[PDB]
């Protein structure tokens with residue numbers, strides 16, 4: 001049996017209980033359950049017991065309840081017994097265990113109150129607007145899971161209350177955002193940060209939940225991790241708490257004047273293993289060592305929370321004028337805020353990584369050749385050519401394309417730095433706010449140098465960065481860059497599932513999905529969409545002991561569906577033996593599993609005789625009778641699910657795309673925007689198959705319908721080949 005409570009046994013010596021804290025927790029838990037009970041009785045009197053209740057866009061009903069006790073709450077009456085249960089577990093005796101049970105009851109009460117609040121919520125007339133999030137949908141949790149698994153998001157800060165001043169709120173939050181922690185904000189700190197023009201919203205991984213009971217939208221976010229990637233069953237309470245403590249490195253920052261309900265909520269965080277750190281001074285009888293502690297000095301509170309939680313940060317430490325971290329990757333710079341730009345079809349541009357010989361490379365040398373961003377009035381433009389020379393003993397020409405990709409990400413982490421595209425199609429923008437802080441191309445070169453030295457210590461011994469901004473000179477060197485681009489394109493042309501004798505595992509997502517195993521082949525990218533076969537091969541050649549390992553293609557069992565003994569044995573050994581077999585070219589029998597970060601899901605529809613596909617960003621209903629989030633609840637979690645499978649979007653353009661099932665010809669329904677994202681690949685592959693370039697017009701989408709009865713007549717009138725193919729079954 002998991003004995004999770006053992007994690008608290010050292011906290012309080014007997015007879016020295018902090019009775020002020022336990023009394024405040026008791027009063028706040030009773031108040032929260034009472035709030036929830038009256039609002040529930042009123043709603044049941046007004047709408048009736050059977051009225052549906054729930055949150056927008058989640059597969060997990062009321063996730064806090066769904067995780068800790070497993071109930072599938074759907075209607076108001078379902079809430080009644082649960083709340084009664086929770087009220088019954090609030091007890092006067094002042095023990096640490098009773099405080100934790102009161103905190104769980106407070107969390108249950110906040111979840112109930114919020115679902116009741118959402119009874120009045122419609123997408124057309126919502127109860128919250130951006131940047132505020134309220135309840136955060138499943139797609140955002142999944143969209144940041146990939147950053148969680150490799151600790152690009154080292155942890156999470158749940159900040160409730162009010163910083164002593166708005167400037168202090170801005171400082172601690174800018175610090176956290178530069179450390180890459182995911183933030184949940186509640187109460188007056190939000191307006192404090194907005195008045196300091198701190199950037200907030202889901203794009204910045206800094207969620208303004210709202211006030212008061214909206215605090216629970218951090219809890220139901222965190223618990224979803226274990227429900228989704230961890231695959232833990234609903235209702236396995238101690239297993240969920242153990243997943244939270246082990247992998248959701250959250251802590252609470254309790255700022256400003258205390259009140260009973262906030263304190264009971266923080267105790268609910270402690271109940272699942274998240275320490276609480278407050279800016280208030282604390283008497284002995286209102287603190288718990290390593291669980292409810294005071295750090296009044298704002299200069300130290302962040303490092304205090306990080307150390308008590310166990311979070312370790314690895315910053316490049318270079319003193320750059322602008323903030324840097326994952327939160328800023330998703331920013332975009334409006335034309336009115338843009339100080340200068342390069343590339344994007346407005347000026348010549350290229351970026352290139354290139355291996356060099358040892359004797360004429362100067363490690364750390366960052367040079368800007370040509371005018372700097374000093375040169376232009378705001379809104380102007382310059383050419384940019386970036387060349388990162390690299391020498392290392394164990395550097396390989398193979399690594400050049402891989403490291404080149406990093407530039408995009410390295411640039412977008414800078415606040416006011418923006419980057420898109422690649423090679424000679426780059427577009428880069430620098431905001432007026434960054435220019436006013438002193439940012440110049442020098443800092444871009446130093447940033448790329450430090451991030452390359454930090455991310456590849458084993459293979460980079462020397463790195464040099466040159467940024468050219470003369471038009472003619474950029475055009476001249478762009479031809480050399482294009483030469484290297486063509487070489488890489490040819491090496492990529494040579495690869496195929498048959499020509500290579502080694503496929504590659506990837507185990508990264510096992511930090512959160514312990515049983516999941518990805519197998520990457522030249523014609524099948526990993527389901528995150530970011531790990532191609534060349535990427536896994538380079539990661540293994542750089543770190544032989546890492547999460548990517550070679551697997552020889554041996555012991556063939558089924559050439560058609562794509563089963564080999566070697567991959568079977570590897571997946572069985574590395575899946576904690578939940579998975580014995582896997583077919584690479586079909587979803588209908590022994591499909592590869594998923595963690596929860598798949599870019600899209602495929603599913604077989606017998607009534608259409610073919611596949612639907614739905615990407616994570618699509619909002620609406622699909623012909624199988626489920627949204628992407630509901631389908632993802634079944635497809636993720638490391639279980640084998642014949643007839644369903646998660647995939648990267650680019651996989652749809654592979655020649656091996658579910659080849660044993662009929663490939664692209666079997667696809668009958670995709671979202672319109674997904675078809676348009678992939679229009680060129682789909683047209684080219686469809687012509688290769690003999691389906692015609694107009695085959696994309698025969699694929700149904702949501703503008704055709706969202707049910708089988710609406711879609712089938714369109715497929716029949718359009719003569720879709722899948723209808724005349726063999727049923728998959």
Ligand code: SF4
Nearest residue numbers: 506509518526528531
């Ligand atoms: S390839 Fe698979 S396991 Fe690796 S990061 Fe991508 S989704 Fe996760």
Ligand code: NI
Nearest residue numbers: 509595596597
């Ligand atoms: Ni994942």
Ligand code: NI
Nearest residue numbers: 595596597598
């Ligand atoms: Ni995943």
